[PDB]
Amino acid sequence: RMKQLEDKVEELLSKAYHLENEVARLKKLVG
């Protein structure tokens, strides 16, 4: 479970980073 949970945190961080990059992209469009 511990292993499952670690995996989930790593999965979530990855998704988080993907979206943060997207926001940046859009932030530039915006300016």
Shortest distance, CB of residue 29 to its own copies, whole angstroms?
A: 5
In the chain, what are the helix, strand and coil shares in percent, each to the nearest 5?
Answer: 95, 0, 5
Alpha-carbon distance of 21 to 15, in angstroms, equals 10
Residues 2-31 interacting with its own copies (rule: CB under 8 A): 2, 5-6, 8-9, 12-13, 15-16, 19-20, 22-23, 26-27, 29-31
- Cα 5 versus chain centre, distance: 17
Residues in touch with its own copies (CB under 8 A): 1-2, 5-6, 8-9, 12-13, 15-16, 19-20, 22-23, 26-27, 29-31
